[PDB]
Amino acid sequence: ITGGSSAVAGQWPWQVSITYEGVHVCGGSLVSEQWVLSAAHCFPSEHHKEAYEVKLGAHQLDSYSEDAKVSTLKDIIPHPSYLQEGSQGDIALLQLSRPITFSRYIRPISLPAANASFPNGLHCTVTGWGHVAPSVSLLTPKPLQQLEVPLISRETCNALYNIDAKPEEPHFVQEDMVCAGYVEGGKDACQGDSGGPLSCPVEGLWYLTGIVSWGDACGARNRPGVYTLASSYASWIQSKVTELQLVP
Ligand SMILES: [Cl-]
Ligand SMILES: [Cl-]
Q: How does the annotation summarize its subunit structure?
């Protein structure tokens, strides 16, 4: 996250770190005792499931915390519609090897209904442990970063992405996507933040409005972060979670 601030410990208790071979690659969101939502682009099919970990209840990644917990994965389920980079369906369900126990530091985020609408301009928050500036990693001990971002329609977002666009870097905000951020530079998600939550405040609660789909723009002008709408996958998520629910 560039142009944001350090969160306080436990402020975003659904935020997880996803590692591959011990290295943080993406964010994710805890949504139940055994499920994490992240982005499909974070999980190429050639990668081995057993090489991933999920770190929950963390604030400073490099600091020891008795409140943090680390898990492996039993399954990685990208949405079947996801094809190449940039395609619709950039969302994945990650099944933890064992269910975790909720705590004040480890809590699920509420999922929006299929028909839940979040209005243009709503001030949501994106969080993550990604770069704090282009090509510049968050320094040890790596406190979780947060940034307030107003929602931007996919239509406005597409027109912005077309300003000084390059054929070598194609972008299209799909029908299952929304944007959030600023027309001017300096405040957005960066490499390492993708897969993480866009958390929106509605009627006293917080909802997982979006999952960072394209978050590598890192504060470039006319490049607000692109997010997969969780509402577009409410039906699929409920189907998977219900069929695969564990014994209590
Ligand atoms: Cl569950
Ligand atoms: Cl459009």
A: Heterodimer of two chains, light and heavy, held by a disulfide bond.
